[PDB]
Design a protein around this ligand. Structure first.
Ligand SMILES: [Ca+2]
Ligand SMILES: [Ca+2]
Ligand SMILES: [Ca+2]
Ligand SMILES: [Ca+2]
Ligand SMILES: [Ca+2]
Ligand SMILES: [Ca+2]
Ligand SMILES: [Ca+2]
Length: 316
């Protein structure tokens, strides 16, 4: 009594691994069967998808790949093979798993990457997160982030891609950082990587005292010089250039007999009294000190001040 053949390959009970990089023409396996009748057998494969991907040599059982594979497109196939004798056909299904190779670089997303942060951001603070996927499996899909070149002022966490400030920032030294993030997969035979720019703008904070312009201020004037005559226009600026504050100008000392007047807003230092060169109160001249004070929006004084001391002499 003729008996139908039986397939034997382990992979009918489990899966047949075919790596995605297998070239067209490669023999991916050989079907094996037993039949008790001393009779030739014919091997093949059925189904439109399977017959397009695989060729079976009728006579030997050898299975060949007809078509290129791509795990990231299709990771898996159900495939029915057949073995035939003089009596009929036997069919069994095989789950064919498409094995992964590291053939994709990491991809950044949510670009462009840029942030604005103020110069007083504390060391330790996390200011950005990069995002990247890699569709490969295992270590070939595991991403490590780093800065190339590395930064003295920022770090990025290898696994999480979180950027932190690692040294005190300062608008007065550096207003912009152009950093470069690297994303590398962990596949040790063939690693792959890609790059993204990260733009960090720095923002100004009031942390600089004002400073006097056009120094020095020591001036000689005619002893005859009348009331209203401008000795000098005094000028100071907020060194915080991003959102400067107004300045208030005062005379602190040495203005003997209220001889001079200093306009609070304009800095115009003028003669107010009648000059008398040899009066014993000021025969040596005037050693005047002047203060510029940064003002709050609402015109009340701040603590940011600067003083300069200069001499006014009187001439024949
Ligand atoms: Ca048979
Ligand atoms: Ca692929
Ligand atoms: Ca990869
Ligand atoms: Ca892959
Ligand atoms: Ca600063
Ligand atoms: Ca500042
Ligand atoms: Ca200031």
């Amino acid at each position: 009594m003729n008996q139908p053949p039986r397939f034997q390959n382990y992979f009918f009970q489990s899966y047949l691994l075919v790596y995605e990089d297998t070239p067209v023409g490669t023999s991916i396996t050989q079907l094996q069967a037993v039949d008790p009748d001393g009779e030739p057998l014919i091997f093949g494969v059925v189904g439109e998808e399977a017959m397009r991907y695989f060729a079976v040599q009728g006579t030997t059982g050898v299975v060949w790949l007809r078509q290129p594979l791509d795990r990231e497109a299709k990771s898996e196939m159900q495939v029915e093979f057949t073995v035939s004798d003089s009596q009929g056909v036997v069919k069994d299904t095989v789950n064919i798993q498409i094995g992964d190779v590291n053939d994709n670089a990491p991809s950044f997303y949510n670009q462009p990457y840029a942030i604005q942060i103020p110069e007083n951001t504390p060391v330790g603070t996390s200011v950005f997160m990069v995002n990247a996927t890699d569709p490969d499996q295992g270590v070939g899909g595991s991403v490590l982030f780093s800065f190339q070149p590395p930064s003295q002022f920022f770090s990025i966490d290898g696994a999480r891609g979180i950027v932190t400030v690692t040294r005190a920032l300062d608008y007065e030294t550096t207003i912009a950082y152009q950093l470069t993030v690297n994303a590398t997969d962990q596949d040790k035979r063939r690693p792959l990587s890609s790059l993204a720019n990260l733009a960090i703008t720095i923002t100004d904070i009031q942390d600089m005292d004002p400073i006097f312009t056009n120094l020095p201020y020591s001036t000689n004037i005619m002893e005859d010089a009348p009331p209203g005559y401008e000795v000098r226009k005094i000028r100071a600026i907020d060194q915080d250039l991003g959102r400067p504050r107004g300045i208030g100008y005062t005379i602190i000392s040495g203005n003997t007999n209220s001889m001079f007047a200093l306009d609070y807003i304009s800095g115009s230092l003028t003669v107010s009294g009648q000059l008398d060169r040899e009066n014993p109160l000021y025969s040596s001249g005037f050693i005047i000190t002047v203060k510029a004070t940064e003002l709050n929006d609402d015109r009340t004084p701040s603590s940011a001040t600067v003083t300069t001391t200069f001499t006014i002499l009187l001439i024949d």
